[PDB]
Design an enzyme around this catalytic site. Structure first.
Site, mmCIF file in Angstrom:
data_model
loop_
_atom_site.group_PDB
_atom_site.id
_atom_site.type_symbol
_atom_site.label_atom_id
_atom_site.label_comp_id
_atom_site.label_asym_id
_atom_site.label_seq_id
_atom_site.Cartn_x
_atom_site.Cartn_y
_atom_site.Cartn_z
ATOM 1 N N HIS A 71 0.830 -1.235 0.046
ATOM 2 C CA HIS A 71 -0.052 -0.114 -0.069
ATOM 3 C C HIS A 71 0.991 1.331 -0.218
ATOM 4 C CE1 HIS A 71 -3.349 -2.381 1.889
ATOM 5 N NE2 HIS A 71 -3.575 -2.331 0.667
ATOM 6 N N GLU A 74 1.778 3.473 3.152
ATOM 7 C CA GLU A 74 2.091 2.774 4.462
ATOM 8 C C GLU A 74 3.841 2.331 4.192
ATOM 9 O OE1 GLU A 74 -2.257 0.782 4.508
ATOM 10 O OE2 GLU A 74 -0.508 -0.669 4.965
ATOM 11 N N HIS A 178 2.705 -3.755 6.639
ATOM 12 C CA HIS A 178 1.932 -2.264 6.416
ATOM 13 C C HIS A 178 1.871 -1.552 7.555
ATOM 14 C CE1 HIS A 178 -1.139 -4.417 3.419
ATOM 15 N NE2 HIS A 178 -0.203 -5.372 3.954
ATOM 16 N N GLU A 269 1.654 -4.932 10.753
ATOM 17 C CA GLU A 269 1.403 -3.793 11.095
ATOM 18 C C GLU A 269 2.108 -2.968 11.885
ATOM 19 O OE1 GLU A 269 -2.706 -3.672 8.779
ATOM 20 O OE2 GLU A 269 -1.442 -2.024 9.724
HETATM 21 N N1 GEM Z 1 -7.538 -9.191 7.758
HETATM 22 C C1 GEM Z 1 -7.774 -7.677 8.008
HETATM 23 N N2 GEM Z 1 -8.638 -7.381 8.627
HETATM 24 N N3 GEM Z 1 -6.496 -7.215 8.253
HETATM 25 C C2 GEM Z 1 -5.253 -7.449 7.611
HETATM 26 C C3 GEM Z 1 -4.499 -6.354 7.408
HETATM 27 S S1 GEM Z 1 -4.550 -5.896 5.718
HETATM 28 C C4 GEM Z 1 -5.413 -4.239 5.795
HETATM 29 C C5 GEM Z 1 -4.764 -3.019 6.778
HETATM 30 C C6 GEM Z 1 -3.824 -2.361 5.582
HETATM 31 O O1 GEM Z 1 -4.225 -2.143 4.622
HETATM 32 O O2 GEM Z 1 -2.782 -2.010 6.499
HETATM 33 C C7 GEM Z 1 -6.043 -3.787 4.418
HETATM 34 O O3 GEM Z 1 -6.206 -4.568 3.573
HETATM 35 O O4 GEM Z 1 -6.258 -2.555 4.351
HETATM 36 ZN ZN ZN Z 2 -2.167 -1.737 4.209
#
Ligand code: GEM
Ligand code: ZN
Ligand SMILES: *[C@@H]1O[C@H](CO)[C@@H](O[C@@H]2O[C@H](CO)[C@@H](O[C@@H]3O[C@H](CO)[C@@H](O)[C@H](O)[C@@H]3O)[C@H](O)[C@H]2NC(C)=O)[C@H](O)[C@H]1NC(C)=O
Ligand SMILES: *[C@H]1O[C@H](CO)[C@@H](O[C@@H]2O[C@H](CO)[C@@H](O)[C@H](O)[C@H]2NC(C)=O)[C@H](O)[C@H]1NC(C)=O
Ligand code: NAG
Length: 380
Positions: A71, A74, A178, A269
């Protein structure tokens, strides 16, 4: 006593390319910079292989991988992986931990899976979405075929390049990074009902240990409160969480790994602030170094060995490794070698293959490391 990184700052594509090339040129004996494809805007999806035998799969040697910046906005993951490239190259030979690590594992590091999105991102953005999707404005983490939801977004070049890459090497353990929270997320990311409930995978046991191996080393993450004032509703016991329970996410790269290859991938994260100011970067490295390091080591736990042919005496390719009561089989590579991550316990492992007669052994995994177990199968 190990040499810490010094290059703490945001690296836009051009500088990241310069950065990567620098290490590939300075440490040619333990590195291999390669591209796995290009982004929509023709940017290279660079991967930095690091091991004492760059460019070759050694029999019985685990393939590991880290992926960040899927992303665009991030950013922490991108920088940490660059920091990690530096740390590993500079310490190989002089640091016993890094030396032993690079020698027993083949590490693949992709700093940015969405370099186009990154370029469109604004430094300082804490929780926005500008630069998140790819150049065609599609969420790459919604782009993979899902086991429940039927994905509609067109497969993107970054997604395709990565799927191919995941098919290219015998990846055992993995983690894509992320931002937007502080916790290590594990499979499954979604459920048949498409709601926020616990979605258990056959390997729920290992995943929790794998996720904990990282969160335990990140003091603030382990505490379970990402950011009490920003996302006050978030509480993750011991810094880990099942994806789906946090919230349903279909088309993720994380589950695609587990369901379409032998790789077990976790989603990390690194902090609530998606794009922190460069002045904060050194702190993120300090808080995650031990975690990044300890996680890679998890690739050596469980069971591993070879599935040989009684007559030839040589490994069987694409043989199957089934475990006691875990409905998730693993396959062998070209040298008949395999790696099966398992939690401490006792199992009834069965090696089998097309044209051979199956063998079953009662293996015992302990709390410390991995046990080697070979299976010699007679032909039919
Ligand atoms: N399975 C869940 N609920 N979360 C996993 C993290 S990916 C999430 C968060 C991110 O983008 O960092 C996304 O796809 O946006
Ligand atoms: Zn993400
Ligand atoms: C980043 O890309 C993703 C796609 O990968 C974008 O998400 C998609 O956004 C559209 C428009 O909001 C969603 O379609 C709408 O769905 C609702 C709900 O059923 C429907 O009522 C509308 O008529 C419309 O069809 C789509 O569901 C959604 N897809 C996914 C996978 O989330 C996202 O908007 C992009 N981000 C930005 C900032 O552009
Ligand atoms: C099971 O099979 C593997 C694969 O051959 C064995 O590893 C070999 O061991 C011999 C002697 O130690 C070496 O000469 C080979 O080079 C090894 N092959 C490798 C590691 O590529 C292993 O020793 C066998 N027994 C077990 C269960 O360890
Ligand atoms: C590899 O093994 C799987 C079963 O585990 C089988 O479906 C697949 O066809 C095999 N690939 C080959 C060698 O064609």
């Amino acid at each position: 006593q190990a040499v810490q990184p010094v290059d703490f700052r945001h690296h836009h594509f051009s500088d990241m390319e310069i950065f990567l090339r620098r290490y590939a040129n300075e440490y040619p004996s333990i590195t291999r910079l390669y591209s796995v494809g290009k982004s929509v805007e023709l940017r290279e999806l660079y991967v930095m292989e690091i091991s004492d035998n760059p460019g070759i799969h050694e029999a019985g040697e685990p393939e590991f991988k880290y992926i960040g910046n899927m992303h665009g906005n991030e950013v922490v993951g991108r920088e940490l992986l660059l920091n990690l490239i530096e740390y590993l190259c500079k310490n190989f030979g002089t640091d016993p931990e890094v030396t032993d690590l690079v020698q027993s594992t083949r590490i693949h590091i992709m700093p940015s899976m969405n370099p186009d999105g990154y370029e469109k991102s604004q430094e300082g953005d804490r929780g926005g979405t500008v630069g998140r999707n790819n150049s065609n404005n599609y969420d790459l983490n919604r782009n993979f075929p899902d086991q429940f939801f039927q994905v509609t977004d067109p497969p993107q070049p970054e997604t395709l390049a990565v799927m191919s890459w995941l098919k290219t090497y015998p990846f055992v353990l993995s983690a894509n990074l992320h931002g937007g929270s502080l916790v290590v997320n594990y499979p499954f990311d979604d459920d048949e009902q498409g709601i926020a409930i616990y979605s258990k995978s056959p390997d729920d046991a290992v995943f929790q240990q794998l996720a904990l191996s990282y969160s335990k080393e990140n003091k603030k993450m382990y505490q379970g409160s990402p950011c009490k004032d920003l996302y006050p509703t978030e509480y993750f016991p011991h810094g880990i969480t099942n994806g789906a329970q946090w919230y349903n996410v279909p088309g993720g790269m994380q589950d695609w790994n587990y369901l379409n290859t032998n790789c077990f991938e976790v989603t990390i994260e690194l902090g609530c602030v998606k794009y922190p100011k460069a002045e904060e970067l050194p702190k993120y490295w300090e808080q995650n170094r031990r975690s990044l390091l300890q996680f890679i080591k998890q690739v050596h736990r469980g069971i591993w060995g070879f599935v040989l042919d009684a007559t030839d005496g040589r490994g069987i390719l694409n043989a199957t490794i089934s475990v006691a009561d875990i409905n998730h089989p693993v396959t062998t590579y070209k040298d008949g070698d395999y790696w099966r991550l398992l939690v401490q316990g006792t199992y009834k492992v069965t090696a089998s293959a097309r044209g051979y007669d199956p063998v079953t052994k009662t293996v015992e995994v302990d709390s410390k490391g991995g046990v080697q177990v070979n299976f010699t199968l007679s032909r039919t």
